[PDB]
């Protein structure tokens, strides 16, 4: 029932349309640290703790 | 004679007829006469037998 058909006197008969959709994303930031003191590194028995 | 012919195709494609299956052919010209000496024309009016 919904086929596109024409006649010899073609006119404003069959029209079609198009659609588009959009997508999105975001960004976040991370990080962590640690701290030490100089005597800890100098006097520890392990040379290579760093 | 100015002759203008449009065959079916993209030439006759239009918003009213997107498919373009109509065509036409036309012809036109200009005419007019000037009479310089009317005295030199002659005429004899009469009836004619069956």
UniProtKB/Swiss-Prot annotation, chain B:
The disulfide bridges present are none
- The stretch of residues making up the signal peptide is none
Subcellular compartments? Virion
Function of the molecule: Assembles, to form an icosahedral capsid with a T=9 symmetry, about 60 nm in diameter, and consisting of 535 capsid proteins.
Q: What is this protein called?
A: Major capsid protein
The record's gene field reads: 56
Q: Which residues of the full protein are shown?
A: 352 to 401 of 401
